mmCIF file of C-alpha atoms in Angstrom:
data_model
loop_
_atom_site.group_PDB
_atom_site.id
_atom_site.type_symbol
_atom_site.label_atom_id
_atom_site.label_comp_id
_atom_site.label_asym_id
_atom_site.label_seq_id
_atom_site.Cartn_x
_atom_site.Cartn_y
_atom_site.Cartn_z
ATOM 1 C CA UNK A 1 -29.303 43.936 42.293
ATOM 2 C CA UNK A 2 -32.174 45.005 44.460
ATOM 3 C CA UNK A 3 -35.166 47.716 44.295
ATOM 4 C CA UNK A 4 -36.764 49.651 46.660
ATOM 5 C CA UNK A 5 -40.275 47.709 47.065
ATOM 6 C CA UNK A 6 -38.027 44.583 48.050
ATOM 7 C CA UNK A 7 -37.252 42.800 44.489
ATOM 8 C CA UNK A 8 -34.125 41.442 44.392
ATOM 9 C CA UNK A 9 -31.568 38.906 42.407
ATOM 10 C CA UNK A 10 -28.690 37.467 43.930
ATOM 11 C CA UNK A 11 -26.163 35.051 43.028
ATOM 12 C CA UNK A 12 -27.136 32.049 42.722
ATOM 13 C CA UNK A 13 -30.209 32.352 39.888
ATOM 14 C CA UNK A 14 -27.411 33.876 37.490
ATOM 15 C CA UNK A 15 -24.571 31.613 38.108
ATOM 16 C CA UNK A 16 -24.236 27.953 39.624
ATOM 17 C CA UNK A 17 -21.417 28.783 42.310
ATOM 18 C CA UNK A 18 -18.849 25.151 43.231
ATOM 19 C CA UNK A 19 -15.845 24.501 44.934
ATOM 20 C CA UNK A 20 -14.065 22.851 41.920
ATOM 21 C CA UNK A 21 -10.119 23.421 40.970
ATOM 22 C CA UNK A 22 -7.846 26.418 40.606
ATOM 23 C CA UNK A 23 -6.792 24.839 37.444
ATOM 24 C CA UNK A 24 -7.338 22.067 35.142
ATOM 25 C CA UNK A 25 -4.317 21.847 32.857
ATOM 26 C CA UNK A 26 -2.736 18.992 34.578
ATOM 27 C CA UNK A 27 -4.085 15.939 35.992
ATOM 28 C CA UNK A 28 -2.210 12.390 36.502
ATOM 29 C CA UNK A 29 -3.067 8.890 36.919
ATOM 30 C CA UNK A 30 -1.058 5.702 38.390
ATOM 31 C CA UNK A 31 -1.658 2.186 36.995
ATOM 32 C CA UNK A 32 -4.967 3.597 35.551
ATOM 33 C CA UNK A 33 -6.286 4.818 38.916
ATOM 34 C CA UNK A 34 -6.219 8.695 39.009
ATOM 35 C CA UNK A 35 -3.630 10.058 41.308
ATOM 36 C CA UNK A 36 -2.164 13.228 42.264
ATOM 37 C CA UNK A 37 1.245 13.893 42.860
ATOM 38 C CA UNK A 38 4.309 16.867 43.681
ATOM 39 C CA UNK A 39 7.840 16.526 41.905
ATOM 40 C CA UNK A 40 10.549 17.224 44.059
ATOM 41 C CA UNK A 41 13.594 19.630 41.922
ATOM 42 C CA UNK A 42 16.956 19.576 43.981
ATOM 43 C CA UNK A 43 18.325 22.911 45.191
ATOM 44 C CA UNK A 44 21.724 23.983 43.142
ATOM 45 C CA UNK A 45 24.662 22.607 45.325
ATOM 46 C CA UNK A 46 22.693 20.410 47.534
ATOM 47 C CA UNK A 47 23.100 16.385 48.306
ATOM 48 C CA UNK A 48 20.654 13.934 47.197
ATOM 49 C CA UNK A 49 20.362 10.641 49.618
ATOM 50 C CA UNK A 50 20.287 13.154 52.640
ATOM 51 C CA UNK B 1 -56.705 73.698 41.027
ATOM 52 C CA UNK B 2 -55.735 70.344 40.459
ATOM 53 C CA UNK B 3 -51.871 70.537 41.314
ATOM 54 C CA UNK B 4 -49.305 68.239 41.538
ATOM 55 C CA UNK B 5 -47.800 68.076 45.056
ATOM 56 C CA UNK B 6 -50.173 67.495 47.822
ATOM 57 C CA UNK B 7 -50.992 70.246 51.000
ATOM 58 C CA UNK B 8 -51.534 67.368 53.732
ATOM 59 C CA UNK B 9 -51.911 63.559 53.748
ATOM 60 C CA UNK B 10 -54.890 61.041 55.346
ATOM 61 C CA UNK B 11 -53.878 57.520 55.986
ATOM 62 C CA UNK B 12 -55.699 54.623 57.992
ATOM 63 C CA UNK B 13 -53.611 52.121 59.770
ATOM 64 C CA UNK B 14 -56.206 49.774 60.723
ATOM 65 C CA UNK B 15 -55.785 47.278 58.909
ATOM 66 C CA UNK B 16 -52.232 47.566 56.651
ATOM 67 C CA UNK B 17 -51.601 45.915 53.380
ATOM 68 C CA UNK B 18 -48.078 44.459 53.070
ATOM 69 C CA UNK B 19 -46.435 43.220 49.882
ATOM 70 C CA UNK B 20 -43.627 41.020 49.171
ATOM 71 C CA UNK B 21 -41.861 39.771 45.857
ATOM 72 C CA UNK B 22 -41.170 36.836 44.960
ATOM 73 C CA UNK B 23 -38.787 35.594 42.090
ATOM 74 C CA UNK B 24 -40.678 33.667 38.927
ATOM 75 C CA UNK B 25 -38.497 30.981 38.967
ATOM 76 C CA UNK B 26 -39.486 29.334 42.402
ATOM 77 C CA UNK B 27 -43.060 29.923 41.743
ATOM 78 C CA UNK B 28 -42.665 27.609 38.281
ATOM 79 C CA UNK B 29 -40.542 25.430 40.077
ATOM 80 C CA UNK B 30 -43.267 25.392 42.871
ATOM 81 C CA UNK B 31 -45.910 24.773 40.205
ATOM 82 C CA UNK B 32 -44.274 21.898 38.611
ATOM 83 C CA UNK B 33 -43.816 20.081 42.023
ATOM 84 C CA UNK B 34 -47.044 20.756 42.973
ATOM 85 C CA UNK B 35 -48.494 18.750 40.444
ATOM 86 C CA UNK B 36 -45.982 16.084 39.088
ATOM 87 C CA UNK B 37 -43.113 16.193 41.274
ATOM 88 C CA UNK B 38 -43.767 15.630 44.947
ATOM 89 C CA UNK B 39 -47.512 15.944 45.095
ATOM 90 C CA UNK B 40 -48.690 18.269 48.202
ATOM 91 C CA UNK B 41 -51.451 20.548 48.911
ATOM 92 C CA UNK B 42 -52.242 22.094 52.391
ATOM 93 C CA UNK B 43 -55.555 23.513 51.737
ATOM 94 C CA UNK B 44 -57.320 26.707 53.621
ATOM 95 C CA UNK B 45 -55.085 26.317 56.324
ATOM 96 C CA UNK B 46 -52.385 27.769 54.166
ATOM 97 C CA UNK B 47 -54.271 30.883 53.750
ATOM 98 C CA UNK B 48 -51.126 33.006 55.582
ATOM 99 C CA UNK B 49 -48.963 33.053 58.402
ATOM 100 C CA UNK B 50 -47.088 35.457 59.576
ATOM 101 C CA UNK B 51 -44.581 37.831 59.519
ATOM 102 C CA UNK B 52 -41.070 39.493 61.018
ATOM 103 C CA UNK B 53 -40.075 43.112 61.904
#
């Protein structure tokens, strides 16, 4: 929001903007240390070792 | 006599106020460095500089 004789506000004294995550539902950890990971689903009528 | 809206307008040029803004929260923020944080003051020398078209 601005005004004619210059006065303005912006967006940054109204919010604190951060790259941070899309969601935070899930979140994983290996032996303790905190890990991400994908799980791989198998397509209907495919083979597995190929 | 004594109307609202004007018939012609006189204006000197020479020299020209200009005014800025300037949000409250940098000004508090400049006050509480200036005096507690990291100390600094300039002096006369920081009487103005200038300015962009």
């Amino acid at each position: 929001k601005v005004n004619p004789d210059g006065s303005q506000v912006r967006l940054k004294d109204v919010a604190d903007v951060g790259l941070g995550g899309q969601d935070y539902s899930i979140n994983a950890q290996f032996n303790g240390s905190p890990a991400s990971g994908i799980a791989i689903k198998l397509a209907t009528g495919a083979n597995a070792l190929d | 006599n004594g109307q609202a809206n004007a018939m012609a307008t006189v204006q000197q040029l020479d020299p020209i106020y200009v005014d800025v803004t300037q949000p409250s929260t940098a000004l508090l923020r400049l006050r509480r460095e200036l005096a507690s944080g990291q100390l600094e003051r300039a002096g006369d020398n920081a009487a103005k500089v200038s300015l962009k078209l």
